[PDB]
Request: fold
Amino acid sequence: GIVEQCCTSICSLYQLENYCN
Amino acid sequence: GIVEQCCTSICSLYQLENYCN
Amino acid sequence: GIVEQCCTSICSLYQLENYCN
Amino acid sequence: GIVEQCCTSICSLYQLENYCN
Amino acid sequence: GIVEQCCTSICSLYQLENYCN
Amino acid sequence: GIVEQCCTSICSLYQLENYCN
Amino acid sequence: FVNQHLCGSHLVEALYLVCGERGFFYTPKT
Amino acid sequence: FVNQHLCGSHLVEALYLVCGERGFFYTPKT
Amino acid sequence: FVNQHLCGSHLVEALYLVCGERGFFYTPKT
Amino acid sequence: FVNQHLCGSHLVEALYLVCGERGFFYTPKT
Amino acid sequence: FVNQHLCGSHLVEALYLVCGERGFFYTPKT
Amino acid sequence: FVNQHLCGSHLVEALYLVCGERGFFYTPKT
Ligand SMILES: [Zn+2]
Ligand SMILES: [Zn+2]
Reply:
């Protein structure tokens, strides 16, 4: 999920957009 | 909605809880 | 103190109210 | 009080220091 | 400048990027 | 740099002023 | 608990604390 | 559900949220 | 350049910044 | 240091930084 | 990405996220 | 009293507080 991608691993702001509605 | 109410008026933590998954 | 209860250990928002005046 | 002054006017970090324990 | 524009109007993340080192 | 002084090690608010313009 | 006046990112911070591991949805009017 | 850890500035943000007008004390040495 | 870790309240602050009006969901259990 | 305009939770953040391990009291007018 | 309305420390938070390890300069008008 | 660690967004929040109008630079690679 987002925690594994962005907190445990790292993610770009572009990847963060995957969680927008 | 809740986003607007909390900012233009006030809101409770119990009202916020309704937005939890 | 609060650090041991809520940072080192974990606490609920109800327990946090213990530190209100 | 300090909470109101900092928001309605301005306040210094030295004024804030008076609220440290 | 960017500090004022973002606050009095709106600004984009792309405009902000110009302030990165 | 600032990260080594203030995050990895520790620094005072006076030392933080070293990074002001 | 007390009532709160929350705008912008402060509302997001409050949802984060209230919901914890449950997570939440942030849905402003468009 | 189970609770998370609240440390440092995040802990006082949470005290501000829960206490608001009542005020609060943050005394880590206690 | 390489990315940093975004956790907890910092992660939802970042979702608020990137998504804004579109809204978002923060579902850590997913 | 410079003077600052601090409302809401921003004041709490400033107290946290200024006081450090000493901690502080947050006491708004009621 | 969406446009954002950022005042005070919120602008600093946004720069931090956008720039990452590159860092940034914060330069308000005087 | 002894100081705490200030990292990431917390470090730039502290730079904003201490520097304000003077502005500042956050250059982690330095
Ligand atoms: Zn704010
Ligand atoms: Zn943090």
Notes: The interface with chain I takes residues 21 of chain B (CB under 8 Å). Residues 8 and 20 of chain B are 21 Å apart (CA to CA). The pocket of zinc ion (ligand 1) is lined by residues G 10; J 10; K 10 (CB under 6 Å). DSSP finds two helices and no strands in chain B.
